[PDB]
Amino acid sequence: KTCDLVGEKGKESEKELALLKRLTPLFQKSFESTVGDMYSYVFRVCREAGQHSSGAGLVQIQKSNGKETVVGRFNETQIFQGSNWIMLIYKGGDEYDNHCGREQRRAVVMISCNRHTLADNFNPVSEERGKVQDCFYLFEMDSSLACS
Amino acid sequence: KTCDLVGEKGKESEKELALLKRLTPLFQKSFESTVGQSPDMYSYVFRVCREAGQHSSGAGLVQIQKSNGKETVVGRFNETQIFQGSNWIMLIYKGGDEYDNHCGREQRRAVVMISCNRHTLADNFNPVSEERGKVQDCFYLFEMDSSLACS
Ligand SMILES: O=P(O)(O)OC[C@H]1O[C@@H](O)[C@@H](O)[C@@H](O)[C@@H]1O
Ligand SMILES: O=P(O)(O)OC[C@H]1O[C@@H](O)[C@@H](O)[C@@H](O)[C@@H]1O
Ligand SMILES: *[C@@H]1O[C@H](CO)[C@@H](O)[C@H](O)[C@H]1NC(C)=O
Numbered sequence: 609k610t611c612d613l614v615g616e617k618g619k620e621s622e623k624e625l626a627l628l629k630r631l632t633p634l635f636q637k638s639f640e641s642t643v644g645d646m647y648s649y650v651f652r653v654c655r656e657a658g659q660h661s662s663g664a665g666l667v668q669i670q671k672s673n674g675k676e677t678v679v680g681r682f683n684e685t686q687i688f689q690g691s692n693w694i695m696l697i698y699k700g701g702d703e704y705d706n707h708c709g710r711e712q713r714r715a716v717v718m719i720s721c722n723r724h725t726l727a728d729n730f731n732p733v734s735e736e737r738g739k740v741q742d743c744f745y746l747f748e749m750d751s752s753l754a755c756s
Numbered sequence: 757k758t759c760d761l762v763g764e765k766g767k768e769s770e771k772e773l774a775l776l777k778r779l780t781p782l783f784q785k786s787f788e789s790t791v792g793q794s795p796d797m798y799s800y801v802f803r804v805c806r807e808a809g810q811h812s813s814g815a816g817l818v819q820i821q822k823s824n825g826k827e828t829v830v831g832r833f834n835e836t837q838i839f840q841g842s843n844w845i846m847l848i849y850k851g852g853d854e855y856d857n858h859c860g861r862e863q864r865r866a867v868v869m870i871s872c873n874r875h876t877l878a879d880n881f882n883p884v885s886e887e888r889g890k891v892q893d894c895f896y897l898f899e900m901d902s903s904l905a906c907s
C-alpha cells in the first residue's frame with residue numbers, strides 16, 4: 609500500500625501522482641523530531657510510521673507513557689507544489705475528544721528546498737487546536753526533491 | 757469589512773487572530789498579474805482582507821476574463837484561513853464562485869503562499885497553477901513575497 613489520493617484508483621490528479629513519483633526515493637526513510645517536550649513525532653512518506661498497523665503516515669508519541677496517537681493516515685493524502693516547496697497533507701488521524709468539534713486530526717508538512725540533503729531537519733512547528741474546525745498539526749522538513 | 761476566520765466571534769483561533777493583526781500593513785495594497793493565452797487570458801487581482809472585485813461581492817481574489825472583462829470570484833475573504841511557518845505564510849480564501857463542470861461543482865478556492873523577502877513589504881504576486889482535475893479540494897495557487905513572512 610502507498611499514499612491514496614482523492615478520486616477512484618487510477619483516476620487521480622496527474623499533478624498529485626507526479627509528485628508522489630518524485631518523492632519515491634523517500635518512501636524507505638523514516639523521520640523523527642528532535643530536541644530530545646513531552647511528545648515525539650515520527651513521519652514517513654506513503655508508508656506506515658506507527659507500530660500498531662493503524663495506517664499512520666505521521667504519529668505522535670507521548671514520552672511518559674508510550675501512547676501513540678495517529679496524526680494523519682496516508683490513505684488520505686493530498687500533495688501539491690510551488691516554486692521551491694511541496695506541501696503534503698495526511699487527513700484521517702485519530703479524533704479529538706475536547707477540541708476542534710471532535711474532528712479527525714490532520715498533519716500538514718511543508719517541505720522546503722535544500723540542495724544539500726535528500727531529506728532532513730524534520731520537526732513540528734505547532735499544533736492548531738483552537739478552532740471550531742479545520743485544526744491541524746504543522747511540520748517542516750528540507751529536501752532537494754522540493755527544489756526546481 | 758475585513759477577513760472573517762472560522763468560528764463565531766470569541767471562538768476564533770488565537771493564532772489566526774494574531775496573524776491577522778500582523779498582516780494589517782497589507783490591507784491597503786492590491787496585487788495583479790496577467791497570465792494565459794486567449795481565449796483563456798486572465799487578470800488575477802488579489803487583496804488581503806479587502807474587496808478585490810470591481811463590484812461588492814466580497815471577493816478577496818478575482819479572475820478577470822480579458823476578452824470581455826467578466827469577473828469570476830476565486831475566493832472570498834469572509835472565509836479566510838491563515839497560518840505560518842518559519843519563513844512563510846499561507847493564506848486561503850474559500851467560498852469562490854462554483855465550478856460549473858469541474859470538481860463536483862464545488863466553490864472555487866484561492867491558496868496564496870507568501871514567502872519571506874526582507875527587501876519588500878509585498879511584491880512579485882504570481883499565479884502558479886490551477887488544480888481542477890480532482891473530485892474535491894480543487895484550488896488556484898499563487899505566490900508572493902513579503903517581509904511579514906520573515907522570522
Ligand atoms: O482529545 P482532547 O481531549 O481534545 O485533547 C487533544 C490533545 O490530546 C493529546 O493526547 C495530544 O494528542 C495533543 O496534541 C492534542 O491536542
Ligand atoms: O465552470 P467550468 O465549466 O467548470 O469551467 C472552469 C473554468 O472556468 C473558466 O472561466 C476559468 O475560471 C477557469 O479557471 C476554470 O477552471
Ligand atoms: C483510511 O483508513 C482508515 C483506517 O482503516 C479508515 O477508517 C478510513 O475510512 C480510510 N479512508 C479511506 C481513504 O478510505
Ligand SMILES: *[C@@H]1O[C@H](CO)[C@@H](O)[C@H](O)[C@H]1NC(C)=O
Pocket residue numbers: 760813814832834835851
Ligand atoms: C461568504 O460570503 C458569501 C457571500 O454572501 C456568503 O454566501 C457565505 O455564507 C459567506 N461565508 C461564510 C463564512 O458564511
Ligand SMILES: [Mn+2]
Pocket residue numbers: 703704705706
Ligand atoms: Mn483525546
Ligand SMILES: [Mn+2]
Pocket residue numbers: 855856857
Ligand atoms: Mn463556468
